[PDB]
Amino acid sequence: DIKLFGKWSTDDVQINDISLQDYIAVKEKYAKYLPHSAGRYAAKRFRKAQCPIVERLTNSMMMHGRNNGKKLMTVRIVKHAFEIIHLLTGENPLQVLVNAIINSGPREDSTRIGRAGTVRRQAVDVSPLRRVNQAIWLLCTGAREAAFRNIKTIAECLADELINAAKGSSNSYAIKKKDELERVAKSNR
Amino acid sequence: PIKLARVTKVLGRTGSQGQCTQVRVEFMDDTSRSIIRNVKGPVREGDVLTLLESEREARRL
Amino acid sequence: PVNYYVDTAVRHVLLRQGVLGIKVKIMLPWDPTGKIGPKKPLPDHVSIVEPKDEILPTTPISEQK
Amino acid sequence: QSVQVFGRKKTATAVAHCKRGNGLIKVNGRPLEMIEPRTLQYKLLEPVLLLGKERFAGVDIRVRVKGGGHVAQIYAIRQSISKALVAYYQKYVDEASKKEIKDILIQYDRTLLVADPRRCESKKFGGPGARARYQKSYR
Amino acid sequence: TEQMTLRGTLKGHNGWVTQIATTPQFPDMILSASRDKTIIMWKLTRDETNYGIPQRALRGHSHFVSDVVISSDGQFALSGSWDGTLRLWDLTTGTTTRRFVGHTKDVLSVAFSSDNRQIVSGSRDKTIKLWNTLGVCKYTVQDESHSEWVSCVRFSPNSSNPIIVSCGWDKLVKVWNLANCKLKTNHIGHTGYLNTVTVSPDGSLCASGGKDGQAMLWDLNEGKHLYTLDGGDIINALCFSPNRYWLCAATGPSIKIWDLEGKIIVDELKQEVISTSSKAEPPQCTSLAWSADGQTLFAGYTDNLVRVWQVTIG
Amino acid sequence: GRVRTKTVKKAARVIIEKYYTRLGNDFHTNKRVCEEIAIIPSKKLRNKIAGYVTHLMKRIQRGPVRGISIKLQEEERERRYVPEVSALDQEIIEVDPDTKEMLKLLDFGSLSNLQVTQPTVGMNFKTPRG
RNA sequence: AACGAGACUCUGGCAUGCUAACUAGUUACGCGACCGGUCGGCGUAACUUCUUAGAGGGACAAGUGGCGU
């Protein structure tokens, strides 16, 4: 039925976790023709889980100062990344995106106890919505400082840090910094 | 031994800067083992977590 | 309501050794206009009329006129 | 046979006149594929890609837009067409098909039929905008 | 020996229904005012999934549609609303024709005569207004009409002298004469404010229901209290049955259908299906309409829904 | 929050205590009766009062409300009850032996409706202190 | 009881209900131009949806379910 960018099917994808079951977007009714729908989801608590996750990626992709309002420059980045994913892995670019979200979010964190400047942490659980938010804040971050000055264009570098993050490879920036947050999560336990 | 878990009821909110929510945690293997685990993030009733360790009780910070 | 229920006046008096300044305010009354005070009431003053005792009925009176 | 309704985002108001016809939908004297931001072409085509050309077969709409920006003009147009077909199918066709259109329109996106009321805040002295303040020094 | 079954529900509104109008001209088209600024013209498909469909909503008002009375032919309707205007429609168009200006407060009830040339309107303005069909103020009753609001005014569908009646919130049932506008009979027998008065289809028997819940019966042409029916809570509507000769008393949660002469209840019309809402109050019966055949009773509640009835002939 | 100040609640309570018959459970009807009885300025105060009147008339039907008059609040309950026989019209009145000695000094030992029960035989009526 | 708070005043959001509009227009009719279509192109005509600004509605924790001496 509804195709993202008119060319990606939305029903053949399959989530794997149940911890991120409802806090990951589109399966059957969040199928939007475009990422930018311009809804108001920051109005009350627990409403950014019910916006499309491609829109979550584009919203977290305009997160530099010189690009802090440009969204029609951002939908032509997911449109210029999902085709690169569909040519590199040969299947739906939405499924690999969900697999990159699931493997990149930390599942165990530590909070600072003590005064200002010094730390003595203690390990705590991670909420599932914060696991979703921490994933896009890492996956979106990885496609900026990589593609800063290394000539290559930024639109395919988002695919470079999404496809290598779906498999759980250690060359992707997100699961690296996830496991750097996990080694310090093992340090207290 | 990666264990998966439920959420019954958040108790309060603790930590130094109030960030840590205290939630009463059920297991998804249908046992009545009601562990208390501190969680960092927005959590409501009916959530499902992935506990790496599943033996430490919650304590104040 | 401070715009039409009060009226302020500032006058400087000149004495021997300096200036005194006086400030006078008056909170005007009601009377929908009697050419004194505003017509508008104070906007939190609720006034409730007293009910008049209607004659209680005992029998169904079918009174033609 | 005439139905005339408007749609609104922030400052853009797009009124839309709907009469019966063949299916000529031309906003501002231009067909929908020719609006220069083509990146929201699917946002523009979300009515016809949800209701089908058979509902748009006996219609004739020329949407009249002004005000706003670009994105606010696009979001004002798609509300106007969707609000025009509802009033058309209410005034001339029975209530049932109007209900079938309206229910799937609000099930897709409520913005398509009722407007977004949020509009710009005033600037306050002491800062560059509405809430942000000028940086204050100490010592 | 005859029951009242839930054949269907007329679910199309958002606000509380206030009045349903029926006609002998059409046993299929049903008009029902409501509290969502919209009168919906129904079309009774009588299907097993639904007894009726919405056909043409009369979206024209700007406040609560307080009352709807229709003409002899099934093309015209007179409607009162809380904005102070009267919207005179034309049912095949879905488009108003007139608008009657001159009521400064909430128009509570209207009524339409048989000859379609006399229009009476009772409002919170404490004024009784006689209207020509064009829009002329024929008569404003400033003849000491009522000291409070007038809840319901009604014409008399009689072969005798056409008379009007005006119950008020000052517990007075006043009778006035058409084209004379003189008070004919006062009825001081009510504790609590009056709500509805309606006339038996012979044009000689009037029932008056108030806040006490006690429907008081009155004559028109001679004017005397005949019987004293009792009910439960506040009466919201009163009708008659032209075929079965019954008193259609509308209490709050249930319709107490009463006999005019035997004063025996046929059926008690109270239906509860949920147990979660046991801490709340059940919806109150405001709209009551008796069709021309009398087989179908159209009752409407405050759950934005109208419950139709069928008489199990046994 | 939405906490009604004492202007709203005071005017609502005195309208309740003066006009309990005109009021009901619908908000919009009570909105109209307060604006003709009372002289209320700008519309947001008329709406806040009439909501408290609706919320207050909801609560009087369930029992007592401490803020309004007792005489009225009790009287409405009575108006909104006669048992056929009195609760003091019993046939068997169970009395103690010591009660019948008092009636014997009251020269009322000749009553027929009495039934002298035996009292309990354990002298235990205090709480086990500690 | 009173001041302060609140109320109040201005502003933002809704009205195909009302009031109107050659210094605002829509729709229609002819005319003109170029391929039944495009006109911020010309003049009459119904009327206020758009556009202006007045009057008035509208929302009150009102309805429902929990938690509440």
UniProtKB/Swiss-Prot annotation, chain A:
GO MF annotation list: mRNA binding; RNA binding; rRNA binding; structural constituent of ribosome
Modification sites for N6-acetyllysine: 32
Residues that bear Phosphoserine: 127
Protein keywords: Acetylation, Cytoplasm, Isopeptide bond, Nucleus, Phosphoprotein, Ribonucleoprotein, Ribosomal protein, Ubl conjugation
Keyword Phosphoprotein: yes
Annotated family: Belongs to the universal ribosomal protein uS7 family.
PANTHER family reported for this sequence: RIBOSOMAL PROTEIN S7
Name this protein carries in UniProt: Small ribosomal subunit protein uS7
Curated annotation (Swiss-Prot), chain B:
Chief subcellular location: cytoplasm
Pfam families per UniProt: Ribosomal_S28e (PF01200)
Gene3D superfamilies assigned to the protein according to its UniProt record, in alphabetical order: Nucleic acid-binding proteins (2.40.50.140)
Subcellular location: Cytoplasm, Cytosol; Cytoplasm; Rough endoplasmic reticulum; Nucleus, Nucleolus
Keyword tags: Acetylation, Cytoplasm, Diamond-Blackfan anemia, Endoplasmic reticulum, Nucleus, Phosphoprotein, Ribonucleoprotein, Ribosomal protein
GO cellular component: cytoplasm; cytoplasmic side of rough endoplasmic reticulum membrane; cytosol; cytosolic small ribosomal subunit; extracellular exosome; nucleolus; nucleoplasm; ribosome
Positions of modified residues (Phosphoserine): 34
Highest taxon in the source lineage: Eukaryota
Keyword rRNA-binding in record: no
Family: Belongs to the eukaryotic ribosomal protein eS28 family.
Subunit comment: Component of the 40S small ribosomal subunit. Part of the small subunit (SSU) processome, composed of more than 70 proteins and the RNA chaperone small nucleolar RNA (snoRNA) U3.
Medical condition linked: Diamond-Blackfan anemia 15, with mandibulofacial dysostosis: A form of Diamond-Blackfan anemia, a congenital non-regenerative hypoplastic anemia that usually presents early in infancy. Diamond-Blackfan anemia is characterized by a moderate to severe macrocytic anemia, erythroblastopenia, and an increased risk of malignancy. 30 to 40% of Diamond-Blackfan anemia patients present with short stature and congenital anomalies, the most frequent being craniofacial (Pierre-Robin syndrome and cleft palate), thumb and urogenital anomalies.
From Swiss-Prot, chain D:
Keyword Iron: no
Pfam family, one: Ribosomal_S9
Any one annotated GO CC term: synapse
N6-acetyllysine PTM sites in chain numbering: 53
Highest taxon listed in the record's lineage: Eukaryota
Record keywords: Acetylation, Cytoplasm, Nucleus, Phosphoprotein, Ribonucleoprotein, Ribosomal protein
SUPFAM superfamilies from the UniProt entry: Ribosomal protein S5 domain 2-like
Principal location listed in the UniProt entry: cytoplasm
Record localization: Cytoplasm; Nucleus, Nucleolus
Annotated GO biological process: cellular response to leukemia inhibitory factor; cytoplasmic translation; maturation of SSU-rRNA from tricistronic rRNA transcript (SSU-rRNA, 5.8S rRNA, LSU-rRNA); ribosomal small subunit biogenesis; rRNA processing; translation
InterPro entries named in the record: Ribosomal_Su5_D2-typ_SF, Ribosomal_uS9, Ribosomal_uS9_CS, Ribsml_uS5_D2-typ_fold_subgr
Any GO molecular function: structural constituent of ribosome
Family (UniProt): Belongs to the universal ribosomal protein uS9 family.
The protein's role, per its UniProt record: Component of the small ribosomal subunit. The ribosome is a large ribonucleoprotein complex responsible for the synthesis of proteins in the cell. Part of the small subunit (SSU) processome, first precursor of the small eukaryotic ribosomal subunit. During the assembly of the SSU processome in the nucleolus, many ribosome biogenesis factors, an RNA chaperone and ribosomal proteins associate with the nascent pre-rRNA and work in concert to generate RNA folding, modifications, rearrangements and cleavage as well as targeted degradation of pre-ribosomal RNA by the RNA exosome.
PANTHER family recorded: RIBOSOMAL PROTEIN S16 (PTHR21569:SF16), RIBOSOMAL PROTEIN S9 (PTHR21569)
Gene name in the database record: RPS16
Swiss-Prot record, chain F:
A cellular-component GO term for this protein: membrane
Glycyl lysine isopeptide (Lys-Gly) (interchain with G-Cter in SUMO2) crosslink residues: 100
Parts of the chain that traverse the membrane: none
Protein keywords: Cytoplasm, Diamond-Blackfan anemia, Isopeptide bond, Nucleus, Phosphoprotein, Ribonucleoprotein, Ribosomal protein, Ubl conjugation
Family to which the UniProt record says this protein belongs: Belongs to the eukaryotic ribosomal protein eS17 family.
Protein name, entry field: Small ribosomal subunit protein eS17
InterPro entries noted in UniProt: Ribosomal_eS17, Ribosomal_eS17_CS, Ribosomal_eS17_sf
PTM annotation (Phosphoserine): residues: 110
Function, as annotated: Component of the small ribosomal subunit. The ribosome is a large ribonucleoprotein complex responsible for the synthesis of proteins in the cell. Part of the small subunit (SSU) processome, first precursor of the small eukaryotic ribosomal subunit. During the assembly of the SSU processome in the nucleolus, many ribosome biogenesis factors, an RNA chaperone and ribosomal proteins associate with the nascent pre-rRNA and work in concert to generate RNA folding, modifications, rearrangements and cleavage as well as targeted degradation of pre-ribosomal RNA by the RNA exosome.
Subunit structure: Component of the small ribosomal subunit. Part of the small subunit (SSU) processome, composed of more than 70 proteins and the RNA chaperone small nucleolar RNA (snoRNA) U3.
Intracellular or extracellular location(s): Cytoplasm; Nucleus, Nucleolus
Main location: cytoplasm
